[PDB]
Amino acid sequence: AVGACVLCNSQTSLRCGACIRRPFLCCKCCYDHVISTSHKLVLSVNPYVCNAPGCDVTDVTQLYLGGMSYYCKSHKPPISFPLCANGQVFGLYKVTDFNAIATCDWTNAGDYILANTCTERLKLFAAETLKATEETFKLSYGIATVREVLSDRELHLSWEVGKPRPPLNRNYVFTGYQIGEYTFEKDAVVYRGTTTYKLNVGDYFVLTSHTVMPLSAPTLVPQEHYVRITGLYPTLNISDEFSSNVANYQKVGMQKYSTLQGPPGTGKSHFAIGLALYYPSARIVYTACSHAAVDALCEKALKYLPIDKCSRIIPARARVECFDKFKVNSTLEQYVFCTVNALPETTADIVVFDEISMATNYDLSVVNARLRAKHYVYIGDPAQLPAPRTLLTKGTLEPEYFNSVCRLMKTIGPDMFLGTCRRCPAEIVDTVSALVYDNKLKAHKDKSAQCFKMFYKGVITHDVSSAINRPQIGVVREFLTRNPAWRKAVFISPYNSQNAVASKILGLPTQTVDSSQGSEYDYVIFTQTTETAHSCNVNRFNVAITRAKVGILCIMSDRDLYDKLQFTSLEI
Ligand SMILES: [Zn+2]
Ligand SMILES: [Zn+2]
Ligand SMILES: [Zn+2]
């Protein structure tokens, strides 16, 4: 029961029993917490509760020290000192932001704003608290029981009454009963088990609620600037392909950590892999939150780095299929590609943390705790999508509040900025450069004259809350007949239910804006589906239209974003 204060690091035995994470609070900070919040239970070796038999006084403000035991006003002996007095709570070794983090329900944007603008120790307390709150919320949903099996990819479900039903998308991964993880897509539903198993009627599925481990390491280590490249040995034979990044690679070796803002198709993975060719003897750990982000780094490394010095770290509880071309689980290899949650306890000369807009402060801290590195490089784009905040329902989360790295990129600017988009037709580059990049993103490609926009509100229907716009899909169908080259397009929308409908009607491969991030396609057909905060979100809009290498058709619901698209308008 001996530890350090979360607010001022002062030593104490005084924890808070009312906080879900039980934080240690010193005498002054414990007082300022109990006297300003509903939190009145204070912990130590023995709790601050009335020692009198059958007494339920647990409020520290109503308790006193009577010799060596604690009693309320009704049971205290004549010679007794109040536990709360002179701005302190009695304890051994004798805050407005801490209070708000400790007592919020995490459903408001303002809660995440505070969790990212607070001191470093409060950022870890907010991250631990938020994650535990998100996990305790998983218990609220209702069990789905297999009532009948139709085919190898379709079934019918029986839901638990009294408990709400979770949205059926690839975002929520169920746990079948321990017969492997399972996913669902919309009474006939589509079943996708991570393990091929003959779906048993009667067997139940439940959401994976995991124990939230405490955070020790900061989200960002303290910054260090050096006069020379430190612990890294550069080449004087750096391939012309990577010469554009030489000054930035040198910046990487001259700072403890560095941030790289790379808009879509500006060369983030090329920069990340080229850093290995610039410091050829450096041990590099390549990390990201998702298996897809890690796999995209493996694909680029397969092209430039020796396959014998690479290893893809895969957790024993293999959830989805990932990169098979490197030797699996050899932690000792020079190049290690691994998701944040599967990182081993190891050291590195450089740690590259990619798709940083998708990281949370919990992820930032975990990386600093498992990896001890000479240099840390954070690659991503605050103008792209953040990790979904399942508890957040009120207010919008701005990019400067996604995590510590994004906060820095949006306030002091990033250390490095990749300014030339090599992927997209100029119509798309010009639109997103003006929309989210302050006119600093330049187009390498010419205009393709294959970027179209149509303003069509259609009809909005809902599959629970996930939206569908059948008339917008009908407009796509009509366009496809007149433009058969577009037969090869990927259909993108902000909603899985819109995508399920488009899949059956158009036969195009489908992708939500959020699952399309990091991917690129020659042709993209995007239907906005609705005018909601979700479908009008400028970061989501940015990702959506920057997936296209050659052409894009945007069927829009919002006049604002439609007018901003620098595309040829279509009629019908
Ligand atoms: Zn304190
Ligand atoms: Zn508390
Ligand atoms: Zn009492």
Curated annotation (Swiss-Prot):
<feature type="binding site">
    <location>
        <begin position="262"/>
        <end position="269"/>
    </location>
    <ligand>
        <name>a ribonucleoside 5'-triphosphate</name>
    </ligand>
</feature>
<feature type="domain" description="CV ZBD">
    <location>
        <begin position="1"/>
        <end position="105"/>
    </location>
</feature>
<feature type="binding site">
    <location>
        <position position="26"/>
    </location>
    <ligand>
        <name>Zn(2+) 11</name>
    </ligand>
</feature>
<feature type="repeat" description="LRR 8">
    <location>
        <begin position="208"/>
        <end position="228"/>
    </location>
</feature>
<feature type="binding site">
    <location>
        <position position="75"/>
    </location>
    <ligand>
        <name>Zn(2+) 13</name>
    </ligand>
</feature>
<feature type="domain" description="(+)RNA virus helicase ATP-binding">
    <location>
        <begin position="237"/>
        <end position="418"/>
    </location>
</feature>
<feature type="binding site">
    <location>
        <position position="33"/>
    </location>
    <ligand>
        <name>Zn(2+) 12</name>
    </ligand>
</feature>
<protein>
    <recommendedName>
        <fullName>Helicase nsp13</fullName>
    </recommendedName>
</protein>
<feature type="binding site">
    <location>
        <position position="16"/>
    </location>
    <ligand>
        <name>Zn(2+) 12</name>
    </ligand>
</feature>
<feature type="binding site">
    <location>
        <position position="5"/>
    </location>
    <ligand>
        <name>Zn(2+) 11</name>
    </ligand>
</feature>
<comment type="function">
    <text>Plays a role in viral RNA synthesis. Multi-functional protein with a zinc-binding domain in N-terminus displaying RNA and DNA duplex-unwinding activities with 5' to 3' polarity. Activity of helicase is dependent on magnesium. Binds to host TBK1 and inhibits TBK1 phosphorylation; the interaction with TBK1 decreases IRF3 phosphorylation, which leads to reduced IFN-beta production.</text>
</comment>
<feature type="binding site">
    <location>
        <position position="55"/>
    </location>
    <ligand>
        <name>Zn(2+) 13</name>
    </ligand>
</feature>
<feature type="binding site">
    <location>
        <position position="19"/>
    </location>
    <ligand>
        <name>Zn(2+) 12</name>
    </ligand>
</feature>
<feature type="binding site">
    <location>
        <position position="50"/>
    </location>
    <ligand>
        <name>Zn(2+) 13</name>
    </ligand>
</feature>
<feature type="binding site">
    <location>
        <position position="72"/>
    </location>
    <ligand>
        <name>Zn(2+) 13</name>
    </ligand>
</feature>
<feature type="binding site">
    <location>
        <position position="29"/>
    </location>
    <ligand>
        <name>Zn(2+) 11</name>
    </ligand>
</feature>
<feature type="binding site">
    <location>
        <position position="8"/>
    </location>
    <ligand>
        <name>Zn(2+) 11</name>
    </ligand>
</feature>
<feature type="domain" description="(+)RNA virus helicase C-terminal">
    <location>
        <begin position="419"/>
        <end position="572"/>
    </location>
</feature>
<comment type="subunit">
    <text>Interacts with nsp8 to form the replication-transcription complex (RTC): nsp12, nsp7, two subunits of nsp8, and up to two subunits of nsp13. Interacts with host TBK1; this interaction inhibits TBK1 phosphorylation and decreases by 75% IRF3 phosphorylation, which leads to reduced IFN-beta production.</text>
</comment>
<feature type="binding site">
    <location>
        <position position="39"/>
    </location>
    <ligand>
        <name>Zn(2+) 12</name>
    </ligand>
</feature>
